């Protein structure tokens, strides 16, 4: 299940006003937590709720709500 | 009326038959020997690979007809830990999938490849077996580069990096990436 | 040898250029079902020689061409070709034309197929494994599972040669039968 995670990203996107670095979306993330967050972001991208920017492979990922 | 060109065509047929029968015979000899030699090598790995993936149990490969090495089937008999030893036909859906993966990974020990693309091969595993499948990949990724298409979270947890493919705009795949290691 | 990079443009759902850098260990490819992760495997299958062009979306029109390039590290000279890095390129145009390249040099599809077959990675190599192979193993038909053991044993070239010879014998006899029939209606 990733919908519960998806909730928290949308909520953490509204609390903040603008960008968020993916690594900062959650203060600290264990490997298991990172995977579910990553899958959550991909699902939010598919539902046209989040804008993503990444310059190269494995560069930092910036998240922005869509409204 | 007899024709020379027809007589020659018949002689040529007979001549070609003599050589082509020898080709066919040698092909049968190559297939029988290579099938059996390879079967012996795969069998030599199968129980160990099975046990690594299931966390116990035991398993065996057996030729259905050892005296017909051109056509014999292969029987697979396996005992998932906590269960009875049975023909693969009678095991659960998840046990069957993992046993097939154990055979494929035993084949990889006999016929190694530098890279291996696994496209959702573990879709049918019981959730409780995914971690040992994922640990197997990590362990043997020193000798085989693994590119793993997967929708099982336990497999992702053992990857070195993740590529995420998703359609932000309809029909158009976007790709992002993150290192776990 | 290992895979370095997969570059994809215009292939199925990859309307925008895609560039996957593989690591030497485990690279996982994930995402929503149907969002294209399985087209990574198809692109690799396609460029190795074993409906292709993006056909349009709500925001995009269909493309005129699809291109995949697979870059391989060849430091150990696993591939029988005298380059440290090997590039294999396959292109297909809307018009039906196809282009094939190895290290940017035009070649035939057969040249790509032969390069990998000669290195030991032909049809029978288990370098790509999908649920189809699991299905073969799990089949109730004995010949389906035997086929997997035959691939492992590399008997395909012997089976193909045997069939080619059996076909030559049949064709030669059929031709003689046809000639004799024509000659008989002449009597």
UniProtKB/Swiss-Prot annotation, chain A:
Keywords: Cell cycle, Cell division, Chromosome partition, Cytoplasm
BP GO terms, sorted: cell division; chromosome segregation; DNA replication
Source organism, top-level taxon: Bacteria
Cell compartments where the protein resides: Cytoplasm
Transmembrane segments: none
GO molecular function terms noted in the UniProt entry: identical protein binding
Keyword check for Cell division: yes
Listed GO CC annotations: cytoplasm
Family: Belongs to the ScpA family.
Function: Participates in chromosomal partition during cell division. May act via the formation of a condensin-like complex containing Smc and ScpB that pull DNA away from mid-cell into both cell halves.
Protein name from the UniProt record: Segregation and condensation protein A
From Swiss-Prot, chain C:
Location relative to the cell: Cytoplasm
Coiled-coil segments on the chain, per record: 155-187
Residues annotated for ATP binding in this entry: 32-39
Effects seen without this gene: Mutants produce anucleate cells and show defects in nucleoid structure and in chromosome partitioning.
Subunit structure: Homodimer.
Family: Belongs to the SMC family.
Function, in words: Required for chromosome condensation and partitioning.
Domain notes: Contains large globular domains required for ATP hydrolysis at each terminus and a third globular domain forming a flexible SMC hinge near the middle of the molecule. These domains are separated by coiled-coil structures.
Protein name: Chromosome partition protein Smc
Protein species of origin: Bacillus subtilis (strain 168)
Residues of the full protein shown: 1 to 199 of 1186
């Amino acid at each position: 299940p990733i919908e519960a995670r998806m909730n928290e990203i949308v909520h953490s996107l509204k609390s903040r006003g603008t960008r968020i670095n993916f690594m900062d979306l959650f203060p600290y993330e264990q490997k298991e937590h990172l995977v579910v967050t990553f899958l959550a972001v991909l699902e939010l991208m598919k539902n046209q709720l989040v804008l993503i920017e990444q310059e190269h492979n494995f560069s930092d990922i910036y998240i922005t709500g869509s409204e | 009326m007899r024709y020379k060109f027809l007589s020659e065509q018949k002689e040529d047929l007979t001549e070609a038959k003599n050589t082509l029968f020898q080709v066919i015979e040698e092909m049968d000899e190559e297939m029988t020997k290579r099938f059996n030699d390879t079967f012996v090598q795969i069998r030599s790995h199968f129980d160990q690979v099975f046990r690594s993936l299931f966390g116990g149990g035991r398993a065996e490969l057996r030729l259905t007809d050892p005296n017909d090495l051109l056509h014999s089937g292969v029987e697979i008999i396996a005992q998932p830990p906590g269960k009875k030893l049975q023909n693969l036909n009678l095991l659960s859906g998840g046990e069957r999938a993992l046993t097939a993966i154990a055979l494929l990974f035993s084949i990889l020990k006999v016929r190694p490849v530098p890279f291996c693309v696994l496209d959702q091969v573990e879709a049918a595993l019981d959730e409780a077996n995914v971690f040992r499948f994922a640990q197997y990949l990590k362990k043997y990724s020193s000798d085989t580069q693994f590119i793993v298409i997967t929708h099982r979270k336990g497999t992702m947890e053992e990857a070195d990096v993740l590529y995420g493919v998703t359609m932000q705009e309809s029909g158009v795949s976007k790709v992002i990436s993150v290192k776990l290691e | 040898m290992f895979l370095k990079r997969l570059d994809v443009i215009g292939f199925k759902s990859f309307a925008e250029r895609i560039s996957v850098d593989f690591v030497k260990g485990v690279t996982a490819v994930v995402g929503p079902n149907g969002s294209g992760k399985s087209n990574i495997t198809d692109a690799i299958r396609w460029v190795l020689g074993e409906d292709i062009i993006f056909a349009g979306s709500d925001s995009r029109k269909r493309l005129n061409l699809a291109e995949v390039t697979l870059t391989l590290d060849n430091d150990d000279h696993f591939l029988p070709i005298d380059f440290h890095e090997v590039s294999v390129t396959r292109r297909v145009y809307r018009s039906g034309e196809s282009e094939f390249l190895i290290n940017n040099q035009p070649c035939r599809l057969k040249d790509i197929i032969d390069l990998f077959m000669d290195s030991g990675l032909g049809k029978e190599a288990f370098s790509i494994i999908s649920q189809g192979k699991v299905e073969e193993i799990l089949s109730s038909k004995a010949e389906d599972r035997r086929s997997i053991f035959e691939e492992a044993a590399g008997v395909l070239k012997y089976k193909t040669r045997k069939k080619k010879a059996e076909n030559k014998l049949f064709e030669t006899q059929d031709n003689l039968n046809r000639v004799e029939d024509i000659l008989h209606e002449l009597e």
